[PDB]
Amino acid sequence: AIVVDDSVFSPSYVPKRLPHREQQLQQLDILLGNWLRNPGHHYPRATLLGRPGTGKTVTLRKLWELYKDKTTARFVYINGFIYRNFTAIIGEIARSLNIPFPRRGLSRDEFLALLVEHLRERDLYMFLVLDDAFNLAPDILSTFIRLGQEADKLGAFRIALVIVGHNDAVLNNLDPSTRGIMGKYVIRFSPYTKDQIFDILLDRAKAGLAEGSYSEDILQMIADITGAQTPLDTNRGDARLAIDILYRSAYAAQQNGRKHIAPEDVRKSSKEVLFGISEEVLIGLPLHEKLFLLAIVRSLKISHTPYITFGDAEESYKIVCEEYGERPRVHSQLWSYLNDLREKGIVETRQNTTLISIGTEPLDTLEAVITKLIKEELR
Numbered sequence: 001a002i003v004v005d006d007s008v009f010s011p012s013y014v015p016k017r018l019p020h021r022e023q024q025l026q027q028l029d030i031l032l033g034n035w036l037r038n039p040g041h042h043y044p045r046a047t048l049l050g051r052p053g054t055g056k057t058v059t060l061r062k063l064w065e066l067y068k069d070k071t072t073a074r075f076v077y078i079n080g081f082i083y084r085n086f087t088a089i090i091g092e093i094a095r096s097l098n099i100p101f102p103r104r105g106l107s108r109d110e111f112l113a114l115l116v117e118h119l120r121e122r123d124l125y126m127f128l129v130l131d132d133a134f135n136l137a138p139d140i141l142s143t144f145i146r147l148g149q150e151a152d153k154l155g156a157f158r159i160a161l162v163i164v165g166h167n168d169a170v171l172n173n174l175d176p177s178t179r180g181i182m183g184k185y186v187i188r189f190s191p192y193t194k195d196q197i198f199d200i201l202l203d204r205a206k207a208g209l210a211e212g213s214y215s216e217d218i219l220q221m222i223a224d225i226t227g228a229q230t231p232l233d234t235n236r237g238d239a240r241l242a243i244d245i246l247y248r249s250a251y252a253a254q255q256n257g258r259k260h261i262a263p264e265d266v267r268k269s270s271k272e273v274l275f276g277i278s279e280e281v282l283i284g285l286p287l288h289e290k291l292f293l294l295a296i297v298r299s300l301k302i303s304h305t306p307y308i309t310f311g312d313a314e315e316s317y318k319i320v321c322e323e324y325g326e327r328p329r330v331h332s333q334l335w336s337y338l339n340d341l342r343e344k345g346i347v348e349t350r351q352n353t354t355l356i357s358i359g360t361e362p363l364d365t366l367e368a369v370i371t372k373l374i375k376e377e378l379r
């Protein structure tokens with residue numbers, strides 16, 4: 001089998017190391033460590049911000065894992081995707097803290113009072129995480145933000161609070177006072193780059209797949225599909241997606257009776273979770289850019305290899321041109337076509353020296369659509 005340990009691919013797996021998150025984990029340690037060792041002398045609070053898949057939840061889980069046996073605090077994890085209103089959240093806090101509810105229906109204030117009484121009378125210390133807190137109404141978020149400041153009612157600073165959002169809107173939608181408590185304890189998780197995605201995936205492959213079933217080039221292909229090139233490219237950089245594609249590709253290969261992941265397993269897996277290549281964006285390419293994309297498609301079909309060289313594509317492109325009765329454009333022109341296809345997300349390139357891959361669309365179907373379009377233009 002290719003897949004030797006599938007738990008290494010589930011959402012809940014917490015890897016041994018978190019490459020590229022050493023800084024955020026350190027920051028968290030700095031905000032929380034003293035209080036976890038000796039709680040109740042000040043109110044620790046942080047806000048973790050970053051797009052989906054930038055390691056916010058995993059980083060926080062790793063922090064807990066390091067302190068789990070070295071603290072009296074209770075880790076009360078609240079997934080804001082699931083528990084959104086006051087009643088749902090206080091109920092999950094109460095369950096996590098074993099606080100029995102009364103027979104009578106309680107008001108919002110009664111509930112908070114009950115939670116304060118239990119924290120105080122049982123001398124408890126809660127590390128409360130409100131994950132994906134953009135899901136809550138701002139008034140709920142403020143209630144919990146303000147609770148940790150009430151040391152005289154609590155008896156100590158009994159609450160350390162981490163809240164998690166995608167961007168600054170989770171804080172900006174708070175009233176000014178409330179915003180005052182959390183601002184400047186902000187830890188930012190930027191979209192992962194291609195190289196960082198690769199390092200994450202290599203760890204997963206080493207832990208979860210058979211030795212020799214995956215190559216560095218295959219992981220690089222998936223990282224080229226998912227990693228952010230520049231940090232403002234916030235629609236990429238998602239490690240969840242990258243790991244999901246790796247696992248889907250390993251399984252596709254295995255189910256087909258193969259021992260090694262091939263480029264087509266990645267393309268098909270990528271298309272199940274991502275937008276593939278738009279026919280609309282193909283139609284608009286100039287003729288020779290279509291022919292050059294057809295050429296890259298033909299070389300990659302022949303190579304069975306994630307990447308082909310620019311020289312390969314150009315030799316393929318001369319053959320393609322003569323088939324379709326066209327004279328081939330010159331090297332520098334092909335170079336600009338490659339630049340444009342890369343800018344549009346149609347192809348991915350990496351330096352060796354230039355390597356080209358098509359990771360987002362199965363080649364048999366791309367090849368058919370591009371051929372159709374060329375045939376129509378040359379009809």
Ligand SMILES: Nc1ncnc2c1ncn2[C@@H]1O[C@H](COP(=O)(O)OP(=O)(O)O)[C@@H](O)[C@H]1O
Pocket residue numbers: 010011012013014015017018019020021050051052053054055056057058059200239240243
């Ligand atoms: N730096 C990393 N190293 C290893 N695995 C990571 C890293 N960052 C994220 N992951 C994995 O990527 C996936 C998404 O991470 P996650 O913490 O769930 O993201 P977020 O809350 O930012 O949306 C999970 O499977 C997580 O374990």
Ligand SMILES: [Mg+2]
Pocket residue numbers: 056057058131132
């Ligand atoms: Mg998360």
